[PDB]
């Protein structure tokens, strides 16, 4: 026996593909623990999830647990340095985050595998003896104020909080979880609250061991990890806090049959239908709400959405279960509305009820359940291995819900068929407890309530009894048929044997006028899956704003037309991505290799013989006008958008595209497609469970389909242009300034252009980014608290690179001078660090760059960047890392002095300032007169362009 451990669980059920090794257990103080041993992992990780969150905030200090969660990162009795924790991680290739939901607070990090204990020890102190320092608390309260600021003007957050504002206001559900400066400082001061005590009190009340789950993943054996967890976590105190429950639904009688008309920020049109339901978590072995979500949310022939779409009322639908908290849940059905749709809310809902009646009428269907069960069994068998940090974070939360032995499978494996539960839930999707919300600009002016926390304008009505009646009498509508057997369900899982000529990187196995094929058989993951990626180049996708619009519209219209047939493939784990790029088009097809040729074929064939529905065209066109307009409401950090336009040779503005959009007529589109398709080049990466012969074959089928149906011919080597980047003058500085009309913050992007990419240029910039990475966060946010969003790092585009800084702030772009201030802090800091501190940073970047991909598509993505950027440097990580180890402090000081210091002979600075809707401290250096960019075209015309990088 062991006193510290209440038990060890039995064998923890894992997929037989999972080579990782597992032990669950429960400590004497009640923490549920999963241990994960992966002797091959590069980074180790842990997470702790406390079953407490904002639903438990004092009614009089909204946001206290979100705030607590910020405060734990800022010092404890054992590690009092304010940023000890984020600094330790940073020097050891890790990072860390945390989130607070209504019932949970989840904290996770990763780190170099050699430093689990160091990281883990620092982390445990969050749960033992946080300082909540007086002065930290004063600063950090601004960061939370900024998180909320950011959300104020966003349609999702306003809807999310509005839902809670309109249930029982007595119910914890109507609390405001983010908090802000007002609720967390101003008003508590007005009321004589000592927030440091309130944090100490709440931590002390609720951070009990009996409400915690911890997961720890590392190279150590299961025994070693056990000792480690026992040692750092046994001492967490147990206060037997009863777990909070909410058996009473926040929506009672008077909340049902309500209609809400809401004014959005963006020009969007949506309908939200919602029914209150009991908590279904406990029925996870059968999962009735998933079953029904699958049916009502179906998109195949026969489906609810098929008809709403055919009547030109909705374009997309989502349905199924939505969590509330322990005690109450929701079932939703939500749709976007066309303009016609907006005038037929009533009929759309009646269709929803007609579709629900059809389910009552046909009863529960075991064959549907069997499909859901097989698909999840297979998903489970062959799940991609996860990145440690997400994985620990996830298991940590679900340890609160499932037996130890089941945590890994609980959410996949279905067991039990439950015509009773399916029928019970189905008996709640009735007009007598429906809630209806319509979001539309047409309610501008018409409304009379204002939600307090966000300012959302809305109106509230009883749904008229006569309407409830008509919905109550919905009869079968023969447009609605359950779906049929799903023919895309895969059945061939054989992993083809590894070829004698297979290679560790992709091999160019086809190099023709028409196509360039890169290919690799998977030699690492051994799952039955593959990725097939294609760039199609046509100079016409982007020749001008109008072509650009057309490429875009074409591809949307296509996807819209494939949707019904493609949906089944997607439930079966076969999916695809298809969009227009500044060069032409991008197609990715991913999932189980088994039926993939079928899907690829149907796509290219549709692409090449497409016929457009006039009605569909008109709808999609209108959604896209709105989409362009709505950009006006994106967040001020937009600064990135304008830099991207200022720095790239060719790029059309959202304004230009919008103008050109009225000239897009049906006749004009039909004409464009054959035009676009007539000369292409294709560069493909085929990668996964496939042979060279299969790959050549798949490539050639794409080619032949295009030739047959669209007479495609090759492009000339020269028309395969890449675009270039603007070359900034030595010693100059340009500012381009604009206003965000919607949000009341600023944003700024500051770019220090350095030089072309290459081994040495790259690694100089990367080491530098690594050394300044947590310091910038720590100074510009944590100390100076200039905004929530504060980012810094390398910028790469068009083969050039530089250092950038992005901040969203309430102070004006001021921001500049503080970054410049910071920049000097850093030279001096680089001078003052020990060699060993220098070399740890090298080591840390090295671990980051060499971290091996855990799954097929992570490996695909690295290769695809080498290909789409035409560097083709597949072994860049070893090369660049070898060179990295070479570098010294002098190199970095020289580099900084040459390209980055305020008086550097090759400084190249551009700043985008986005002003707000209205518009101790280190010493900021004096700055030059900037040059104000007046006009984007001119600014480009008056400067050189860089060369493009040479291939590998």
């Amino acid at each position: 026996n062991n006193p510290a451990i209440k038990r060890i669980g039995n064998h923890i059920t894992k997929s037989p593909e999972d080579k990782r090794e597992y032990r669950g257990l429960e400590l004497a103080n009640g923490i549920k623990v999963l241990l994960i041993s992966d002797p091959t992992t590069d980074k180790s990780s842990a997470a702790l999830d406390v079953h407490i969150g904002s639903l438990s905030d004092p009614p009089n200090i909204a946001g206290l647990s979100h705030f607590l969660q910020h405060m734990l990162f800022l010092g404890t009795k054992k590690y009092p340095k304010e940023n000890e924790y984020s600094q330790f991680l940073s020097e050891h290739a890790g990072s860390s985050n945390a989130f607070t939901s209504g019932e949970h607070t989840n904290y996770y990090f990763d780190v170099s595998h050699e430093h689990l204990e160091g990281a883990l020890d620092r982390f445990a102190q969050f749960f033992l003896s946080p300082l909540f320092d007086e002065s930290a608390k004063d600063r950090e309260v601004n960061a939370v104020d900024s998180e909320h600021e950011k959300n104020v003007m966003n349609d999702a957050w306003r809807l999310f909080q509005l839902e809670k504002a309109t249930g029982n206001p007595k119910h914890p559900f109507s609390k405001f979880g983010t908090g802000n400066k007002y609720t967390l400082e101003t008003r508590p001061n007005q009321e004589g609250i000592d927030v440091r005590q309130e944090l100490l009190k709440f931590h002390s009340a609720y951070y009990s061991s009996n409400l915690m789950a911890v997961v720890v993943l590392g190279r150590e054996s299961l025994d070693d990890l056990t000792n480690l967890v026992v040692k750092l976590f046994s001492e967490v105190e147990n206060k037997n806090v009863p777990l909070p429950e909410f058996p009473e639904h926040p929506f009672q009688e008077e909340h049902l049959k309500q209609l809400y008309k809401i004014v959005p920020i963006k020009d969007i049109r949506n309908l939200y239908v919602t029914f209150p339901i009991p908590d279904l978590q406990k029925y996870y072995k059968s999962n009735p709400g998933h079953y029904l979500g699958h049916l009502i949310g179906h998109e195949g022939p026969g489906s609810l959405l098929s008809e709403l779409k055919s009547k030109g009322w909705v374009n997309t639908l989502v349905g199924g279960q939505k969590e509330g908290a322990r005690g109450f849940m929701f079932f939703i059905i939500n749709v976007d509305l066309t303009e016609e749709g907006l005038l037929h809310v009533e009929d759309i809902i009646l269709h929803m009820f007609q579709y629900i009646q059809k389910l009552r009428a046909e009863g529960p269907q075991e064959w549907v359940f069997q499909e859901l069960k097989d698909l999840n069994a297979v998903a489970f068998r062959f799940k991609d291995k996860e990145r440690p940090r997400g994985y620990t974070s996830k298991i940590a939360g679900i340890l609160h819900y499932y037996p130890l032995e089941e945590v890994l499978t609980a959410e996949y494996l279905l067991e039990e068929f439950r015509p009773d539960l399916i029928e019970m839930v189905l008996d709640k999707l009735r007009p007598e407890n429906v809630r209806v919300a319509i979001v539309s600009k047409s309610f501008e002016g018409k409304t009379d309530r204002t939600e307090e926390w966000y300012g959302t304008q809305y109106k509230q009505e009883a749904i008229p009894d006569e309407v409830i009646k008509k919905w109550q009498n919905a009869d079968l509508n023969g447009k609605f048929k359950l779906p049929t057997k799903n023919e895309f369900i895969p059945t061939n899982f054989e992993i083809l044997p590894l070829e004698k000529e297979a290679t560790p990187y992709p091999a160019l196995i086809k190099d023709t006028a028409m196509s360039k094929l890169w290919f690799k058989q998977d030699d690492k993951f051994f799952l039955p899956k593959a990725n097939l990626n294609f760039e199609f180049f046509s100079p016409f996708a982007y020749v001008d704003p109008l072509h650009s619009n057309m490429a875009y519209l074409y591809l949307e219209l296509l996807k819209d037309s494939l949707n019904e047939y493609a949906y089944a493939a997607e439930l079966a784990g076969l999916s695809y991505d298809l969009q227009n790029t500044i060069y032409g088009m991008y197609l990715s097809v991913k999932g189980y290799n088994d039926k993939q040729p079928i899907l690829l074929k149907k796509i290219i064939e549709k692409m090449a013989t497409f016929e457009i529905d006039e009605k569909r065209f008109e709808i999609i066109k209108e959604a896209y006008m709105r989409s362009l307009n709505n950009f006006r409401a994106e967040q001020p950090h937009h600064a990135m958008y304008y830099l991207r336009l200022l720095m790239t040779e060719v790029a059309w503005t959202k304004d230009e595209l919008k103008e050109a959009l009225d000239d897009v007529t049906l006749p004009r589109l039909k004409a464009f497609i054959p035009q676009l398709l007539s000369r292409l080049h294709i560069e493909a990466l085929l990668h996964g469970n496939i042979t060279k012969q299969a790959a050549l074959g798949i490539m050639q089928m794409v080619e032949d389909t295009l030739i047959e149906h669209a007479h495609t011919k090759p492009l000339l080597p020269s028309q395969l242009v890449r675009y270039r980047e603007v070359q900034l003058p030595d010693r100059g500085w340009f500012v381009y300034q604009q206003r965000n009309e919607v949000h009341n913050n600023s944003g700024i992007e500051i770019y220090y252009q350095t030089d072309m990419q290459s081994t040495s240029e790259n690694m100089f910039l990367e080491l530098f980014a690594q050394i300044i990475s947590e310091p910038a966060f720590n100074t510009l946010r944590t100390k100076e608290q200039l905004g929530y969003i504060v980012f810094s790092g390398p910028r790469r585009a068009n083969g050039i690179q530089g250092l950038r800084f992005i901040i969203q702030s309430e102070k004006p772009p001021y921001l500049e001078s503080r970054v410049e201030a910071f920049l000097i802090t850093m030279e001096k800091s680089i001078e003052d660090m020990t060699e060993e501190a220098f070399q740890k940073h090298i080591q840390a970047l090295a671990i980051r760059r060499l971290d091996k991909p855990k799954k097929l598509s992570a490996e695909s993505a690295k290769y695809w960047g080498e290909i789409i950027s035409q560097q083709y440097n597949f072994d860049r990580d070893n090369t660049e890392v070898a060179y990295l180890k070479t570098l010294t402090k002098e190199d970095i000081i020289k580099f900084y002095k040459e390209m980055l210091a305020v008086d550097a002979p090759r400084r190249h600075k551009v700043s985008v300032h986005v002003l707000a809707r209205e518009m101790n401290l280190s010493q900021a250096p004096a700055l030059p007169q900037p040059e104000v960019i007046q006009n984007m075209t001119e600014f480009k015309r008056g400067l050189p362009l860089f060369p493009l990088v040479k291939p590998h």
Partner: peptide, 20 residues
């Protein structure tokens, strides 16, 4: 039309970055 993981439950910042 089927509710996604991030709709049915309240996701971490980590789960979101995961599809980028």
């Amino acid at each position: 039309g089927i509710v996604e993981q991030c709709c049915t439950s309240i996701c971490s910042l980590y789960q979101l970055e995961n599809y980028c």
